[PDB]
Every structure is written in structure tokens, then in C-alpha cells.
């Protein structure tokens with residue numbers, strides 16, 4: 001500490017951290033200090049733009065980040081991750097262990113339609129196919145279109161939270177091509193069946209890629225980097241953390257005991273005599 | 275499914291879930307549908323009130339929850355949990371495994387001053403002792419006052435995000451007694467040492483207890499329930515998740531390699547032969 | 549790197565690690581190299597004695613640790629942690645994320661009877677009371693005795709893995725008073 | 733001064749013990765006799781905390797509070813006058829004597845079997861002093877059709 005204070009030694013640093021200068025007079029975020037964060041009245045969308053992307057996003061995009069963190073909150077306790085959070089909360093664990101144990105389900109099959117429905121429509125649009133041949137290409141290869149398909153709400157009966165995001169994108173975004181492409185794929189697949197409307201998990205993906213590569217400060221190689229890196233997995237995990245902590249506090253407030261999962265729902269299929 | 279649809283059989287349900295009715299026409303949060311949530315212009319503070327506490331919080335308190343999630347975001351990468359997120363992200367894992375591996379550090383020594391600083395000041399205020407006796411009651415038991423004490427910035431050098439939160443809980447915030455108590459304890463301990471200002475961890479604890487028990491819709495056996503359940507560890511974990519996902523995306527964007535922690539920083543102290 | 553090589557600048561090292569000297573010719577476990585681990589024919593009970601306790605345990609208790617890791621293996625998928633592992637594995641996740649999501653249930657209500665049933669009987673025996681006063685003390689305070697109680701199989705219908713472990717701690721095992729107190 | 737009526741369609745009870753099959757049988761009987769209110773107001777189990785048990789009122793699911801002490805079971809419920817004592821043979825005596833220090837309890841059904849005769853005579857003596865009518869020991873209970881049924885009597 002003294003040979004480096006008077007500066008007669010070299011030590012190579014790791015942990016390069018282009019975010020959150022913690023030391024000094026203020027919490028500098030990306031480049032913006034914390035008093036400038038609260039002075040410009042940017043919400044949590046502004047600090048998600050600062051921490052995650054290191055860019056002061058325009059004020060129509062911070063509000064869309066808060067919208068897509070409000071729709072990807074809790075979606076009932078039936079789903080697999082909220083189920084794990086409840087099972088871990090009824091064992092009386094912790095907030096962190098319960099949220100964490102339910103958070104580790106968010107992978108490819110649960111909650112992996114944000115990133116897959118963004119990557120799929122981005123790879124279809126950047127190559128340049130008409131949607132009428134993109135649908136036929138997806139039929140010839142197995143591989144259902146990620147982000148299209150609902151179980152009940154079909155036609156003039158929408159998801160009612162894909163409506164809110166679709167109207168916010170249609171009003172407060174300039175230059176929205178990828179949403180138009182995904183809505184043409186919706187126009188075809190809703191002719192295939194009364195279902196197959198755009199999901200919430202697909203419209204947040206295509207509107208988030210649209211918001212990255214359409215608004216300012218993102219060129220084309222950053223807005224295609226943050227989709228490969230997984231900023232949309234971040235959007236889903238940070239959105240669903242409120243739902244999983246809500247389930248933890250709820251199952252901890254109802255004072256419910258350990259789960260045991262009845263044997264008549266199990267059906268052991270063991271070998272003969274190993 | 276047929277003996278229940280015509281209703282000739284009983285089966286006791288588990289998983290009580292007083293939150294997030296997922297099925298039916300709209301996604302209903304606590305008692306409010308999703309279109310009323312987006313129509314009444316409540317931010318993520320309003321949906322934290324709806325999911326976590328199941329009460330429509332007044333508009334000065336949803337903005338305070340958004341503010342106290344903005345300050346409990348990233349606090350630099352040297353701290354223990356963000357260090358674990360960086361280590362697990364440089365090992366090329368995943369977003370959820372990295373954020374999870376860093377999130378499982380949020381315990382009692384890292385991130386457990388929110389809840390301890392709220393429980394300590396609530397136990398000192400609900401018992402009824404003057405702050406000049408509370409400081410001496412702590413000092414004669416060991417146990418430093420949690421929530422009070424900074425390393426650098428205290429007096430004629432304020433914390434600058436204790437100040438913004440304190441201005442908000444003085445303007446838009448009716449009848450806040452425990453904050454006044456905690457500032458009296460600060461008035462004593464800053465006369466002890468020029469340090470020992472209120473932390474951010476102490477001020478969000480006491481201002482959140484005052485937000486619970488001083489606004490409407492919480493009586494005093496719910497505002498004393500949610501502190502014991504851990505609804506402040508939820509605030510710290512959900513706030514710091516943005517910083518941990520920011521560190522994940524950042525270490526994935528710099529293309530950093532696997533960490534190895536050099537042997538000159540380790541000092542093995544193994545036994546002789548056992 | 550060069551000033552510390554010739555030693556011209558001291559540095560305080562953290563992470564004190566009294567286990568597993570990884571560098572050198574042999575991977576030295578607690579104080580014993582890896583060739584002495586494999587040559588002396590200690591199983592994984594010996595390396596748990598070396599890693600966890602940093603002692604070379606006697607050979608009857610290494611086999612006891614292998615025994616009590618064999619009985620505390622799977623106990624059906626209905627229980628809470630194996631349920632979380634199955635729920636995370638059926639989401640197609642990972643091995644480490646599935647094991648981890650099911651492992652984070654090992655707490656107090658599931659899996660927390662080993663440590664509580666050891667602490668309870670050890671605090672009752674260290675104090676020095678007769679068992680008939682211990683049962684009545686637990687009855688007077690709420691607090692069911694941890695480590696006592698089976699749903700199905702108890703008396704002349706035994707548990708049959710309490711019996712194998714009980715025969716092992718009776719046979720190869722000198723001076724066992726706390727088990728005798730627990731059996732009273 | 734013992735009572736001359738015991739059970740009615742306003743009679744509620746406190747079940748001492750986690751005997752959810754007996755309580756569910758009583759609630760099913762009170763549904764099938766077209767009562768308007770469930771005749772079990774609370775349960776008392778001294779080995780667990782205060783929570784709520786999820787029971788069946790016909791098709792509907794109701795919640796019956798399980799307490800830890802008998803005192804706060806009496807304090808939240810002033811209309812309770814019956815205690816059905818499902819304790820063992822070595823804990824029915826002190827739980828019954830604890831119950832007869834509450835004034836609202838007008839009858840105690842002791843379901844246990846094997847209480848010693850001296851402790852039972854002490855129970856008879858203090859019940860005649862307090863005026864509380866005790867249902868004779870090692871019983872199954874007593875059923876009043878249309879009004880009230882004590883635990884496992886009748887059967888399914």
C-alpha cells in the first residue's frame with residue numbers, strides 16, 4: 001500500500017468493470033452521478049439503461065423498459081419457477097434461497113421465449129425473407145415459431161397486455177420495422193388457426209430489439225451484441241423477481257407448512273431387481 | 275377431470291396464493307386487473323405494492339419504492355455479491371447462474387443492514403426509550419448500531435443519496451416519527467465521531483418502516499409483520515439485481531476470461547501431517 | 549511479480565485456507581499427499597475426514613461416514629428438494645442448476661433434523677439430566693423432540709436403515725454414551 | 733348446577749388436538765344437517781404455532797384457526813362452550829383441569845381412554861364444583877342428530 005502510494009510499483013488489475021464507479025464523492029453510474037440520475041427524473045428504466053447498456057436512453061424507452069418489467073412480473077403460481085419459489089418458501093428457507101431456487105428455472109423452456117423470439121425474428125428480418133416464406137421455412141424444419149401461440153385468447157379477444165405494449169410501441173416509437181414484420185407473421189399464423197396471436201413473450205422480444213436498433217445511441221453492432229449476450233433474459237429475470245418475492249412473502253404470511261407431494265401423483269416405474 | 279367438472283368429488287387444494295390470478299380474461303394482480311394497473315399510471319412501485327403487500331399504495335409511496343430501488347442498485351464491483359457475479363460470469367456461465375451466484379451472498383453481513391437497521395430502530399422506538407439511552411444501551415452490550423456508520427462521507431461531506439431520500443421523505447411523506455428518532459440517534463453518534471452518519475441502509479430501513487406504519491391500509495400488525503417476514507431484504511435483493519445483471523452483461527461484453535486468484539494472495543496454513 | 553520474487557515489498561494475504569495445498573509436486577490434502585491417500589486405502593470417508601475435519605480419522609469411522617452418506621442418499625421424489633430438482637430438470641435446465649434449485653431447500657423443515665437432532669440431544673446430555681426429565685422438559689415447552697418419530701414403521705416393524713447404522717455403531721465403535729442416551 | 737340442554741344449532745366447540753379427520757367429520761355432519769355455522773370454532777394444538785387449517789364446508793373451503801394456547805383460543809371466541817378433549821391418557825387430566833378454569837366452557841367431552849381412576853375422580857369432583865358436565869371417559873362421543881356430533885361418533 002505504501003510502495004504503490006508513492007508509485008514505484010506495477011500491479012496488473014483484473015475485473016475491468018465499465019459501470020458504477022463506487023468510490024469518490026458520489027455513486028457515479030455509467031457516467032452519470034446519482035444526483036444527476038435523480039435530477040433528470042429517470043425512473044428505473046433510466047438506471048437500467050445506465051447500468052445495463054451504459055447509455056442514457058430517451059424518455060420513451062425508459063418508460064417502455066418499465067412497461068416490460070411490469071408485464072413480465074408475476075403470472076400466477078402454476079408456472080414452474082413460481083412453483084419452485086413456493087416449494088422453497090414452504091420449507092421456511094430465506095428470501096434469497098426461495099427467490100434463487102425459483103429463479104434457476106428461468107432457462108430455455110420457462111422464460112426462454114424472450115431471447116429466442118427476439119433472435120428468431122431478428123435472424124429472419126436481417127436475412128430478408130417475406131413473412132409468407134418465413135412461416136413456410138419454419139414449418140419445413142420442425143421448430144415452432146417462438147413467441148407466437150397462446151392457449152385461450154385468440155381473435156378479437158387479445159391478451160390485453162400485448163395490447164398495452166403494442167399501443168405504446170405504435171405511439172411512442174419512431175421507425176418500428178421488426179414489429180411490423182412480426183405482426184405480418186401474426187397475420188399469417190392467425191389465418192392458420194384462430195390462436196397463434198403474438199405472445200407477450202414474443203412482442204417484448206421484437207419490440208425490445210426494435211427499441212435497441214431503432215432509437216439513438218445504439219449502432220448496429222451493439223444492438224446485436226446485447227441480444228446475443230442476453231439483455232432480454234435480464235429483462236425477464238428482473239421482471240419476474242418481483243413476482244417470485246411476492247410469492248415468497250405471500251407463502252410466508254399465510255403460515256403454510258412443508259410440501260410433501262402425494263404419492264398418487266408420482267407413478268414409480270422402477271426396474272425389476274437391479 | 276370429469277368427476278370434478280360435474281362436481282361429485284372433493285379434493286383439498288394446496289398452494290393458497292393470495293396474489294396474481296392468472297386465469298380468466300385478464301391477468302389480475304392482487305385485486306386489480308392489468309389494464310387498471312397500466313391505466314392508473316402506477317410505476318413498478320405500484321406493482322410492488324400490489325404483488326408484495328397486496329395493497330394499492332398511495333402515489334407518494336410507489337415513487338419512494340422506485341427511489342429506494344434506484345439507490346440500492348449497483349454499488350460498484352468490489353463488494354461481495356457483485357464479486358461473485360463477476361467471477362461466475364467470467365467462467366462463462368449464464369445470466370441466471372451468474373446473478374444467482376452473486377445473489378446468494380445477500381445475507382447478514384452483505385445486504386443485511388436494511389432489515390437489521392429497521393428491526394433495531396423499531397425495537398428501540400416501540401419499547402420507548404430516548405436516543406441518548408438507546409446509544410448507551412447498545413454500547414453496553416457490544417453490538418454497534420446497524421445502519422449508522424460510513425467509511426468516508428459523513429458531516430460537511432454528506433452521502434448525497436441519503437440526502438435525496440431524506441428530502442423525499444420530508445416533502446412527500448406525512449407524519450414520519452421513526453425517521454425523526456433515527457436522526458436524533460444520528461445527532462448523538464455524529465457528536466461521538468465526525469463519521470457515523472446515517473447509511474443508505476439505515477435510512478431506507480427506517481423510512482420504509484415509517485412508510486409501512488404511517489400511510490394508510492397497514493394497521494400495525496401488518497406493518498410489524500412485513501418487517502419480520504423480510505420485505506426489506508426483498509427491496510435490497512430486487513434493487514441490487516439490476517446491478518448484478520449489469521455486471522454480468524458488462525463482463526460478457528469485455529470478453530473477460532476465467533479468473534484464477536493468484537497464490538500470493540492466499541497464504542495456505544495447512545497442518546503438519548494429519 | 550518481480551519485486552515480490554526477490555522480496556522487496558510485503559503484501560497482506562487474505563483467504564487463509566487451512567486445507568488442500570494445491571501447488572507443489574503432489575496435491576496435498578489436509579496434511580497428507582494424494583499418493584498417501586490412495587496408498588493407505590481410505591475411501592471417501594478418509595478424504596471427508598481430511599477435507600472437512602483435517603484429521604486422519606480411524607478406519608471404523610471413515611466407513612461410518614460412507615455408511616451415513618449411503619443412507620442419506622435419495623429418499624423418493626415426493627420430498628421437497630427432489631421435487632425442486634425434478635421441476636428444474638423438466639424445464640430442461642442444467643445439471644448444476646437442477647441440483648442447485650433442489651439443493652436450496654435443505655434448510656430447517658427439510659433436511660434440518662440431522663443438525664437439530666444432534667444439537668438437542670447433545671444439549672440435553674451435556675447438561676446432564678435423566679431421559680425421563682428430558683422428555684418432560686420438551687413436553688412442557690412445545691417443541692417436539694427432533695429426531696424421534698416415524699410416520700409408518702416403528703416398533704417390531706423397524707426402519708431397517710436405523711438398524712444397520714445401529715448395528716454398526718454398536719459393533720465397531722468404542723465408548724458410545726450419547727447413542728445410549730438417545731436409545732433411552 | 734349442570735345444564736339440561738347441551739347441544740344446539742348454535743353450539744360451537746374447541747377441538748383440543750390435531751385430529752383433522754374427526755373435525756372434518758363434524759363439519760361434514762354439520763353441513764348435511766343444514767346448519768348455517770360450523771360447529772368447530774378453533775383447534776388447539778400446543779406443539780405448533782398459531783395458523784389456520786383448510787377445511788371443507790360442503791363444496792366450499794373454509795379456514796379454521798389452530799391456536800397454541802387455550803387462552804387465546806378462548807379470547808378470540810366467546811361463544812364456545814364445548815371442548816372436545818382428544819388428548820392422550822397422560823395429558824387429558826391437566827388439559828381438562830386447565831379448561832375448567834374458563835367460565836364459558838359448559839361441557840367437556842374427554843375422548844381419551846386409560847386415564848387412572850384417581851385423576852378421573854378428581855375431574856368428577858372439580859366438574860361438580862364448577863358445574864361443568866363431563867362426558868364419561870373412553871367414549872366415542874355423543875351424537876345429537878340435527879344439531880351436533882362429538883368427533884368420531886356415528887362414523888363416516
Ligand SMILES: CC(=O)SCCNC(=O)CCNC(=O)[C@H](O)C(C)(C)COP(=O)(O)OP(=O)(O)OC[C@H]1O[C@@H](n2cnc3c(N)ncnc32)[C@H](O)[C@@H]1OP(=O)(O)O
Pocket residue numbers: 139144145146148149189192193196
Ligand atoms: C361434430 C361433427 O359432426 S364433426 C364436425 C367436423 N369434423 C371434423 O373432422 C372437423 C375437425 N377439424 C378440426 O378442428 C381438426 O381437429 C383439425 C385437424 C382441423 C385441427 O387442426 P389444428 O389443430 O389446427 O392443426 P395443428 O394442431 O397441427 O396446428 C394448426 C397449425 O398451427 C400451427 N402452429 C401450431 N403451433 C404453433 C406455434 N407454437 N407457432 C407457430 N405456429 C404454430 C401449425 O404449423 C399448424 O399448421 P398446419 O395446419 O400447416 O399443420
Ligand SMILES: CC(=O)SCCNC(=O)CCNC(=O)[C@H](O)C(C)(C)COP(=O)(O)OP(=O)(O)OC[C@H]1O[C@@H](n2cnc3c(N)ncnc32)[C@H](O)[C@@H]1OP(=O)(O)O
Pocket residue numbers: 413418419420422423463466467470
Ligand atoms: C499533532 C499530532 O498529530 S499528535 C497530538 C498528540 N497525540 C494525541 O493527542 C493522541 C490522540 N489519539 C487519537 O486520536 C486516537 O485516534 C483515539 C484513541 C482518540 C481513537 O479515537 P476513536 O477512533 O474516535 O475511538 P473509536 O474507534 O472507539 O470510536 C469512537 C466511538 O464511535 C462508536 N461507534 C463506532 N462505530 C459505531 C457505530 N456503527 N454505531 C454506533 N457507534 C459507533 C464507538 O462505539 C465509539 O464509542 P465510544 O467512544 O463511547 O467508545
Ligand SMILES: CC(=O)SCCNC(=O)CCNC(=O)[C@H](O)C(C)(C)COP(=O)(O)OP(=O)(O)OC[C@H]1O[C@@H](n2cnc3c(N)ncnc32)[C@H](O)[C@@H]1OP(=O)(O)O
Pocket residue numbers: 687692693694696697749818819820821822823843844845870871872
Ligand atoms: C370400535 C370403536 O368404536 S372404539 C371403542 C371406544 N373408542 C374409544 O375409546 C376412543 C379412544 N381414542 C383413541 O384411542 C385416540 O387415539 C386418542 C384420543 C387416545 C389419541 O391418543 P394419541 O394418538 O396417543 O395422542 P397424540 O397423537 O396427541 O400423541 C401422543 C403423545 O405422543 C407425543 N409426541 C408426538 N410426537 C412426538 C415427538 N416427535 N417427539 C416427542 N413426543 C411426541 C405427543 O407429545 C403426545 O405426548 P403426551 O402423551 O404426553 O400428550
Ligand SMILES: O=C([O-])CC(=O)C(=O)O
Pocket residue numbers: 075079109110111112113201
Ligand atoms: O415466460 C414463459 O415462457 C412462461 C410464462 O410465463 C407463461 O406461462 O406465459
Ligand SMILES: O=C([O-])CC(=O)C(=O)O
Pocket residue numbers: 349353383384385386387475
Ligand atoms: O453492506 C451493504 O449493504 C453493501 C454496501 O452498501 C457496501 O458496499 O458497503
Ligand SMILES: O=C([O-])CC(=O)C(=O)O
Pocket residue numbers: 623627657658659660661662
Ligand atoms: O431429513 C429429512 O427431514 C428429510 C427426510 O428424511 C424425508 O424424506 O422425510
